[PDB]
Symmetry: C2
Subunit: 416 residues, 2 copies
Amino acid sequence: SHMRILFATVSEKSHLFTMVPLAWSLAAAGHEVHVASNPALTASIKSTGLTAVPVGKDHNLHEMLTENLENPLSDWSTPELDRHSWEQVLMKFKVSVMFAYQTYNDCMVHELVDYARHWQPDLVIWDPVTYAGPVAARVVGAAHARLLWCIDIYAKMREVFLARLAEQPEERREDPMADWLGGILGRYGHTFDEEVVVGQWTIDQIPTSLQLPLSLRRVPVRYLPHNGPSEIPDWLREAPGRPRVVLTSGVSARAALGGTFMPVADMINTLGSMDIDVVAALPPEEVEALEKVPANTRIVDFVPLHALLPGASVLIHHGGFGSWGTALVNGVPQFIPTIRYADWWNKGTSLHEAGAGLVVHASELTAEVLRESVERLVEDASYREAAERLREENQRTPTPHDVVPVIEELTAEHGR
Amino acid sequence: SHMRILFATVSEKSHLFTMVPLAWSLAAAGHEVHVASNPALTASIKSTGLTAVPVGKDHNLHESLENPLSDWSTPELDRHSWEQVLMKFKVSVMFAYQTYNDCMVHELVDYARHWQPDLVIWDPVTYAGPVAARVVGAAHARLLWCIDIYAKMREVFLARLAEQPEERREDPMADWLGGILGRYGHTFDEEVVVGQWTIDQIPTSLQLPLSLRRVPVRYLPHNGPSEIPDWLREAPGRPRVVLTSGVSAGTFMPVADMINTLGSMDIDVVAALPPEEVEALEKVPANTRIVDFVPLHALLPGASVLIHHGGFGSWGTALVNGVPQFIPTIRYADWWNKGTSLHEAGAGLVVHASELTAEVLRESVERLVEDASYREAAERLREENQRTPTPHDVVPVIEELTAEHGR
């Protein structure tokens, strides 16, 4: 019967939007669903229809990032024993905890624990780098599960870490994740456990065929596009004269694209010279950039990506899940010029190896590569066919609706 | 299989919010759900997480409320001659339904032709909805926020129509909607008035019995964009009394007089009030907190009384929280029925707005706080709601009915 369910996410709109269909599935089954994050994300939560719970204070991650992306210690794209000594994987955990996880989470973890103590959720569903979530859950005995937008490099890197940890003598064992999260749990009289790192189970929006196999309790769920507040405009109605090519700087990540590789304006100009229709979703920032707007190019601040991608031929993006997933469910071939940050590279590579799209490193992106890649995805039918196979795989996955009872049972099993 | 589902509502946020949980239930099952209304409501739709489709132009309804011809509170044969019920349909079509719908009906038909929804779910006075559905052969159903005075008055109307000689037959609803349908080459049918089926958020025990295909569904509060504030955490020292003007709100007792009465009582008061009635007050009593926004669903747990005009958001949210209601209201829409249904059940109190005095306000609140029979009856209705299938549970029913009745 009736549950209180707390969603927890770091203050990224892009992360939040991946959680909205599952949150609404649970609300639609009669459960109370509250979404907690830093105050900066309150307005975004409120536009999802879901109840927002602002917790703690805003953090400095964006200043830290812009003032300094892809270096070997931030590269979790190849989480394999073969490529990690103990000290390499330990160092990755040390730096990811210090720079990313603590910045994202420490600003709100105590306030989240407080809210959980007051509200007493039966279940906490957490974005996979929102480790404040399982801490708060554990303190109040709630069941808790990750909800994945990601190729699961996090749990896979953890597996590598634990294999190497087991090879060390007792005195040389160190775990930055256990120190950090165990420290916080200790202050509330609770123990650390490995389930705070990977959840009691994992609800996974990545199609099984493209996901890394792991020793987890895994609940596959269908990705349903939610790209933030949307309306269908009048101009959308007229189905497309020639191949439609869509380009997003993303939903975040706009303002951390290095600057140091091929500019937005150069990409627009390349696409401007092609026999296609271009729709470019660009932020006021990079909109000021451009001298001309090509004849074949329409520019938008907001577009409902899910409404735009039906019938489109190509989506060009940095590997964010909103874009990746929405193109996937529409069977649209993807071109992903990106970096080894988060799982973006894996998002590109997974499609590339399946023959459903193309990945290239952002640093290697030229007008010639852009043009040739788009041409190939338009002309070579093998791309659409492979994309269509992935579309069908998504379509066979149980919906949020279908997994509601599974989540209910798992909560009963693992919670208070 | 995967459906395109078009929600249609008149441009009232209060109506829209009643539809949001069912819309999201269907979206969560993998269906595409678009919500169409006049452009003024696009911002509200977008804050629900649902995809908005602006259609047509904004209307002049805003630019006399309780009078006998607008009173559908007692839709009974016994109280309606043919000419009385005919006149009610003539005036409701001319003044309310056409104003709400004619500004967007053609644009909605156009959108339906383009998008080809399998199913249209319509707010019960959004007759543009079933017109658009019928034109494209879609299944369609009403989603009710209301004690169903609309379908009940229609039943009275049809009983009296059948008593008339052929020459004296007249149907303002058929003329209006049949006229529009005719221009697109389609027939009028009675199902455009009551839907192919009715999805009903009113607990069965409080709803008027009708000859309809009826799918009960649990009301889940959605009161628009909400956040939980810090001050809510401190559970209540004494009876909490909540007062909403609603989304409306003046020749009867003013808001300022109500606040002053409640200000003198041994209670905590939370008053959700709009800009100009906030300026209205000289003092704010010590026991009174004033808010522009409060998430009613978060506010009403542990509250003792909700005072409101009979809007469904308030009514339903108090109902699911087991909170006794005091409804000083008028015979507009189903507001009076919302009050009287609770009154007869012993779960709250209704009074006509014109009879509201400081003495009646004080005494009614005291009774709902002190007499435990009110909380107990409210709690029974809470439990009745809780036994109703959720939007989640009725998704398959809606799928099957769409297959049965649609293309």
